[PDB]
């Protein structure tokens, strides 16, 4: 499923994420835009053999099991394919553990490079929230 901007904002604002660990909702919508272009089915292979999955491009070396990343940790205790569902619940719950592990949203390279220090509130502007 390819979410609309305000549609995703609302679903994220329905699942715990507005100001979770101090990150306003505009940060999360910005990160989803540049990580996945709002597409729940996005996958990308990395050079170390791991793969990033879903709306927030969660990585298989640490967070989910795709059965083909040797020596991975499955810290969210899910198969990576659950991160591709149209229901974003699994993605949001895993993202909550990632952002809580000490490094905040810097875990997401596109957030660091394209959202951090920008006017992230513009990403929820005009939405009925
Ligand atoms: Cl915001
Ligand atoms: Cl932080």
Swiss-Prot record:
CDD domains: LYZ_C (cd16897). InterPro entries: Glyco_hydro_22 (IPR001916), Glyco_hydro_22_CS (IPR019799), Glyco_hydro_22_lys (IPR000974), Lysozyme-like_dom_sf (IPR023346). It catalyses: Hydrolysis of (1->4)-beta-linkages between N-acetylmuramic acid and N-acetyl-D-glucosamine residues in a peptidoglycan and between N-acetyl-D-glucosamine residues in chitodextrins. Residues 1-129 form the C-type lysozyme domain. One of its GO terms (cellular component) is cytoplasm. Disulfide bonds join 6-127, 30-115, 64-80, 76-94. Belongs to the glycosyl hydrolase 22 family. It is an enzyme of class 3 (hydrolase). SUPFAM superfamilies: Lysozyme-like (SSF53955). Its EC number is 3.2.1.17. It comes from the Eukaryota. Its main location: secreted. Lysozyme C is capable of both hydrolysis and transglycosylation; it also shows a slight esterase activity. It acts rapidly on both peptide-substituted and unsubstituted peptidoglycan, and slowly on chitin oligosaccharides. In the egg white and polymorphonuclear leukocytes. One of its GO terms (biological process) is killing of cells of another organism. It is found in: Secreted. Transmembrane segments: none annotated. Substrate binds at residue 101. It comes from Gallus gallus (Chicken). The keyword NADP does not apply. This is Lysozyme C.
């Amino acid at each position: 499923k390819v979410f609309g901007r305000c549609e995703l904002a609302a679903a994220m604002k329905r699942h715990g994420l507005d100001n979770y660990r101090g990150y306003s909702l505009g940060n999360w919508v910005c990160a989803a835009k540049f990580e996945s272009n709002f597409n729940t089915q996005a996958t990308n292979r990395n050079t170390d053999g791991s793969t990033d999955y879903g709306i927030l491009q969660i990585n298989s070396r640490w967070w989910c099991n795709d059965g083909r990343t040797p020596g991975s940790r499955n810290l969210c205790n899910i198969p990576c394919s659950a991160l591709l569902s149209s229901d974003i619940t699994a993605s949001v719950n895993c993202a909550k553990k990632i952002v809580s592990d000490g490094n905040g949203m810097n875990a997401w390279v596109a957030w660091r490079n394209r959202c951090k220090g920008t006017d992230v509130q513009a990403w929820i502007r005009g939405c009925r929230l």
